[PDB]
Amino acid sequence: DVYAQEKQDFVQHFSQIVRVLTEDEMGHPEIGDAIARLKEVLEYNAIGGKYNRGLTVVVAFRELVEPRKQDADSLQRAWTVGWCVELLQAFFLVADDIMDSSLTRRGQICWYQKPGVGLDAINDANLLEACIYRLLKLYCREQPYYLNLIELFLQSSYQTEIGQTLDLLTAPQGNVDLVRFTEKRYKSIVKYKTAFYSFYLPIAAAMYMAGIDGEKEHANAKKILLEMGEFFQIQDDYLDLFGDPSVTGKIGTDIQDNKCSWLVVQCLQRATPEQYQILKENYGQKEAEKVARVKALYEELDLPAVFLQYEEDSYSHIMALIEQYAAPLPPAVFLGLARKIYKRRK
Amino acid sequence: DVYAQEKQDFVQHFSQIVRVLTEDEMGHPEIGDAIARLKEVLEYNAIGGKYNRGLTVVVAFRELVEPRKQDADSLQRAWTVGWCVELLQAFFLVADDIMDSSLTRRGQICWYQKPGVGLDAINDANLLEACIYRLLKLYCREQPYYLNLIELFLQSSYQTEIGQTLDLLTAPQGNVDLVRFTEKRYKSIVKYKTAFYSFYLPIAAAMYMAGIDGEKEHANAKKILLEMGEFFQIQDDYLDLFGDPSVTGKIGTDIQDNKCSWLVVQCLQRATPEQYQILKENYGQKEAEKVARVKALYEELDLPAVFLQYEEDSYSHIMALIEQYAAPLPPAVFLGLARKIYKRRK
Ligand SMILES: O=P(O)(O)C(Nc1ncnc2sc(-c3ccc(C4CC4)cc3)cc12)P(=O)(O)O
Ligand SMILES: O=P(O)(O)C(Nc1ncnc2sc(-c3ccc(C4CC4)cc3)cc12)P(=O)(O)O
Ligand SMILES: [Mg+2]
Ligand SMILES: [Mg+2]
Ligand SMILES: [Mg+2]
Ligand SMILES: [Mg+2]
Ligand SMILES: [Mg+2]
Ligand SMILES: [Mg+2]
């Protein structure tokens, strides 16, 4: 919508970002090779996704600054903060792929699986985290919102690592306990691991950039953007199994990795004592046969139909939340975002 | 010296730090388990080292604030920033151990080698990075230096990741090229990977905390503290091979991991065309026999004697740098630190 409009401009700005993060060798030639490697990391890991999050920073900026106040530089900065959220993303993915033993991301092989990278990936990832704050310094240093943004990113990082910790504690390798896999636990997980950084972070960054720094303006926004995030991670769990790797750009692992996926939580609730045992006996194991038994059992309970039911009822519920809590913000900010993820298949 | 004096107080402050980083569940019970895991990570990975860096923050604080201005809270904050540098350290180690395929750290098994952790270590590490900025917020939020410290830590993180990148690019697995292993390259590596965060970071943090924020006061300090860092990493490379694992708390890997160690750089400079080939043929391989051939060749060139020569001449050179550049800072700040690392064997 407004998103599809703004992409080409956002994506072309990536070159400047890179010309800029590699202007550090235009003062220190002894680190050339490290900069080269950094470029490479960026090229491979910052590109090829949908860019929802970065664009959401820029769309929300249009919609919250009076166009008088949108000078050339105001925009350029917003492109950057936009990119700053894409770096956050990049950093999480490079490292969640190692942790999740994934094979492919955005329709290429995962950075760590590349010949000659492996676990150097862990540095690569953190360099990407670093680059955020180097951009904030280089573009927003003189702005009233600087500190708010720095605290926002870090703060959001921390909540997201917290969420990752639960994702992992709840899904221990070679230990199939399913007592653990509940509704309450699921909600907590996705709240922390996905919702703060994929949905609040980028909107609030746009709000901070427009001088809207009020506690209650952020609290309301959050009530909306968090439930939106929950829904989005459920989408993500559905696609892990039922998506198209031609389209999602990634092969699934929730079952192999013994994950507290939305799927498995719904399964337990419906399964017969009989069926519980197929699951127990096939879940969280690297064997194709056992994975398949679980997919089938999921299809046996017409869980893709329950997905579609839930996706309709949550989208409504979210719309209720926009009616209740958007004010004084243009509903469009939240709607544009909602449209871009409802009935999504990539 | 002043260090040995201040430790007991610094180490006891670790409990408060933990009671404080786990007071987040005193608002959000749904993340208990993640906090538990965080405690555990901290306990295992923040403890057992020398604490040079953290103590150096606190020693330098004594020596730069007029004792009138050292109220209870002023100290407590300095303990924290001190601990903030130990968290930085913790985070780098947890993850450098994975990247370096190390077995033991501070005389226990490396966190990632623990049964039931493995590559979840990558999250664990980043949680430790997070905790720094959560402490800065919770203790130094209202201070004039806050932003300076935040930029200092991040900035220092970034330079250290840059340095890590070179460490790794220069030491590719299963690819023994020794053209790469030069003096110039070595200096660059250790400058970035060790010196900024182990030596500048903690002193400058103490300076920022004492309102000494002048460009030239930090530049001079840096000239000193960077050369000090170089020397310290050379020490670290010597101990990798020639130390006592009973004492260093860690088993070495520079040879196996094909590292641009101070040792190997000195070796090349001295070796006969004959000897160059033993090295080429045994370096960077996981085989005990081949490692041993290299150790022996190193002992063949009386490199431990060259170490002791260099350690004397650099310590002198550093002392010259303190005579030249300490002012207006108490020489003690730099000397206390120098004494604590000269002729060091752990
Ligand atoms: O691999 P995906 O793309 O399905 C997905 N990736 C994510 N989706 C939503 N939120 C998050 S947070 C996250 C992540 C990555 C790394 C870390 C730690 C290094 C900090 C923490 C969180 C990955 C991720 P997940 O099913 O693995 O959760
Ligand atoms: O393992 P050690 O203790 O000998 C030593 N550890 C370090 N010593 C001095 N500086 C540094 S910087 C560093 C490190 C760790 C992790 C990272 C990336 C995750 C950020 C970057 C740098 C480890 C390290 P090294 O010989 O591996 O260099
Ligand atoms: Mg994951
Ligand atoms: Mg994953
Ligand atoms: Mg997923
Ligand atoms: Mg290393
Ligand atoms: Mg190491
Ligand atoms: Mg070492």
Side-chain angles (χ1 to χ4, degrees), chain A residues 3-4 6-7 9-15 17-18 20-22 24-25 27-65 67 70-74 76-113 115-136 138-140 143-175 177-178 180-183 185-186 188-214 217-222 224-245 247-273 275-280 282-285 287-288 290-301 303-338 341 344, chain B residues 3-4 6-7 9-15 17-18 20-22 24-25 27-65 67 70-74 76-113 115-136 138-140 143-175 177-178 180-183 185-186 188-214 217-222 224-245 247-273 275-280 282-285 287-288 290-301 303-338 341 344:
Chain A
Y3 289 94
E6 306 259 17
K7 179 167 316 202
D9 275 30
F10 189 64
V11 171
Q12 282 167 41
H13 199 60
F14 186 78
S15 297
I17 282 154
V18 181
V20 140
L21 291 170
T22 73
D24 213 25
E25 80 195 318
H28 314 131
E30 71 194 314
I31 73 174
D33 302 355
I35 298 298
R37 162 72 166 230
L38 176 59
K39 176 155 171 205
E40 202 178 313
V41 177
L42 284 163
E43 317 271 42
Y44 195 103
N45 289 292
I47 292 297
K50 295 183 291 283
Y51 314 109
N52 283 336
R53 287 170 195 84
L55 292 175
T56 308
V57 158
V58 160
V59 163
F61 186 74
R62 296 311 194 162
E63 298 179 13
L64 296 169
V65 170
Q70 307 186 18
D71 56 308
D73 301 345
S74 272
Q76 171 131 303
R77 283 191 285 273
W79 299 146
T80 300
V81 171
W83 274 103
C84 285
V85 183
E86 287 297 309
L87 295 181
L88 201 71
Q89 178 71 340
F91 146 78
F92 291 146
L93 296 192
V94 160
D96 177 88
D97 288 342
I98 306 172
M99 292 164 61
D100 280 345
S101 273
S102 279
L103 306 169
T104 69
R105 170 72 65 179
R106 297 171 183 164
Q108 36 181 14
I109 188 185
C110 290
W111 181 240
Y112 83 109
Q113 298 275 18
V117 161
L119 289 182
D120 292 12
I122 301 164
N123 187 44
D124 293 319
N126 283 278
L127 266 178
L128 295 166
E129 185 185 37
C131 280
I132 293 164
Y133 303 96
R134 289 199 64 215
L135 289 169
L136 295 186
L138 276 160
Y139 278 79
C140 317
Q143 300 301 319
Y145 48 78
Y146 190 45
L147 195 52
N148 276 325
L149 289 183
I150 289 199
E151 293 194 338
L152 185 60
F153 275 78
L154 303 166
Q155 162 71 337
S156 286
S157 298
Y158 166 75
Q159 289 153 305
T160 290
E161 297 152 356
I162 280 302
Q164 192 76 321
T165 305
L166 288 180
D167 183 68
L168 298 174
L169 287 176
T170 305
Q173 172 185 66
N175 181 294
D177 205 353
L178 324 154
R180 308 186 150 288
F181 290 175
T182 66
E183 193 86 70
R185 182 63 156 200
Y186 184 69
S188 314
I189 295 181
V190 305
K191 179 164 160 172
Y192 279 85
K193 58 145 173 167
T194 305
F196 288 104
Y197 95 109
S198 295
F199 295 99
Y200 178 71
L201 166 61
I203 291 303
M207 298 168 65
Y208 284 118
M209 291 180 82
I212 309 154
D213 46 53
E217 282 75 15
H218 283 263
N220 289 347
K222 175 178 293 175
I224 287 165
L225 294 164
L226 295 207
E227 269 271 318
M228 204 162 284
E230 189 187 290
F231 162 104
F232 178 99
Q233 179 58 51
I234 288 179
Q235 290 190 306
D236 179 74
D237 292 351
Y238 181 82
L239 296 171
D240 187 70
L241 198 48
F242 293 123
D244 194 315
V247 183
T248 73
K250 78 209 183 176
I251 298 150
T253 52
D254 295 355
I255 293 158
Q256 300 87 315
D257 301 355
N258 190 35
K259 291 291 165 73
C260 191
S261 170
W262 183 73
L263 291 173
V264 74
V265 175
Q266 292 302 307
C267 186
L268 294 178
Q269 283 183 24
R270 283 161 161 77
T272 57
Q275 289 162 315
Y276 186 99
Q277 215 72 4
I278 303 283
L279 189 66
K280 186 177 165 195
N282 295 273
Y283 206 75
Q285 274 159 85
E287 275 104 39
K290 306 191 182 176
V291 170
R293 252 182 297 268
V294 177
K295 181 157 192 189
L297 168 59
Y298 282 164
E299 282 163 353
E300 169 61 12
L301 291 158
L303 288 194
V306 185
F307 175 54
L308 294 178
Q309 201 42 71
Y310 173 91
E311 162 168 39
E312 189 219 306
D313 297 9
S314 171
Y315 174 96
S316 288
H317 181 76
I318 283 165
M319 295 305 137
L321 291 180
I322 294 188
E323 274 186 75
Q324 176 171 351
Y325 284 118
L329 298 176
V333 171
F334 304 91
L335 291 183
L337 181 56
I341 78 171
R344 90 190 168 95
Chain B
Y3 289 94
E6 306 259 17
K7 179 167 316 202
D9 275 30
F10 189 64
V11 171
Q12 282 167 41
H13 199 60
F14 186 78
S15 297
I17 282 154
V18 181
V20 140
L21 291 170
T22 73
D24 213 25
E25 80 195 318
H28 314 131
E30 71 194 314
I31 73 174
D33 302 355
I35 298 298
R37 162 72 166 230
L38 176 59
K39 176 155 171 205
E40 202 178 313
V41 177
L42 284 163
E43 317 271 42
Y44 195 103
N45 289 292
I47 292 297
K50 295 183 291 283
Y51 314 109
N52 283 336
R53 287 170 195 84
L55 292 175
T56 308
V57 158
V58 160
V59 163
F61 186 74
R62 296 311 194 162
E63 298 179 13
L64 296 169
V65 170
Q70 307 186 18
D71 56 308
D73 301 345
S74 272
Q76 171 131 303
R77 283 191 285 273
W79 299 146
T80 300
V81 171
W83 274 103
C84 285
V85 183
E86 287 297 309
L87 295 181
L88 201 71
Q89 178 71 340
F91 146 78
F92 291 146
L93 296 192
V94 160
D96 177 88
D97 288 342
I98 306 172
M99 292 164 61
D100 280 345
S101 273
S102 279
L103 306 169
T104 69
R105 170 72 65 179
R106 297 171 183 164
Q108 36 181 14
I109 188 185
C110 290
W111 181 240
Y112 83 109
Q113 298 275 18
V117 161
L119 289 182
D120 292 12
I122 301 164
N123 187 44
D124 293 319
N126 283 278
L127 266 178
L128 295 166
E129 185 185 37
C131 280
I132 293 164
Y133 303 96
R134 289 199 64 215
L135 289 169
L136 295 186
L138 276 160
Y139 278 79
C140 317
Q143 300 301 319
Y145 48 78
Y146 190 45
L147 195 52
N148 276 325
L149 289 183
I150 289 199
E151 293 194 338
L152 185 60
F153 275 78
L154 303 166
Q155 162 71 337
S156 286
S157 298
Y158 166 75
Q159 289 153 305
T160 290
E161 297 152 356
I162 280 302
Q164 192 76 321
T165 305
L166 288 180
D167 183 68
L168 298 174
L169 287 176
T170 305
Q173 172 185 66
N175 181 294
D177 205 353
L178 324 154
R180 308 186 150 288
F181 290 175
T182 66
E183 193 86 70
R185 182 63 156 200
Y186 184 69
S188 314
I189 295 181
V190 305
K191 179 164 160 172
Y192 279 85
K193 58 145 173 167
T194 305
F196 288 104
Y197 95 109
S198 295
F199 295 99
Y200 178 71
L201 166 61
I203 291 303
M207 298 168 65
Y208 284 118
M209 291 180 82
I212 309 154
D213 46 53
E217 282 75 15
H218 283 263
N220 289 347
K222 175 178 293 175
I224 287 165
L225 294 164
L226 295 207
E227 269 271 318
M228 204 162 284
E230 189 187 290
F231 162 104
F232 178 99
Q233 179 58 51
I234 288 179
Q235 290 190 306
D236 179 74
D237 292 351
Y238 181 82
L239 296 171
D240 187 70
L241 198 48
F242 293 123
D244 194 315
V247 183
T248 73
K250 78 209 183 176
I251 298 150
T253 52
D254 295 355
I255 293 158
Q256 300 87 315
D257 301 355
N258 190 35
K259 291 291 165 73
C260 191
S261 170
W262 183 73
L263 291 173
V264 74
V265 175
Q266 292 302 307
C267 186
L268 294 178
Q269 283 183 24
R270 283 161 161 77
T272 57
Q275 289 162 315
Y276 186 99
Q277 215 72 4
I278 303 283
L279 189 66
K280 186 177 165 195
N282 295 273
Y283 206 75
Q285 274 159 85
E287 275 104 39
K290 306 191 182 176
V291 170
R293 252 182 297 268
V294 177
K295 181 157 192 189
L297 168 59
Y298 282 164
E299 282 163 353
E300 169 61 12
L301 291 158
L303 288 194
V306 185
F307 175 54
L308 294 178
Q309 201 42 71
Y310 173 91
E311 162 168 39
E312 189 219 306
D313 297 9
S314 171
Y315 174 96
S316 288
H317 181 76
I318 283 165
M319 295 305 137
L321 291 180
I322 294 188
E323 274 186 75
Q324 176 171 351
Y325 284 118
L329 298 176
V333 171
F334 304 91
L335 291 183
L337 181 56
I341 78 171
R344 90 190 168 95

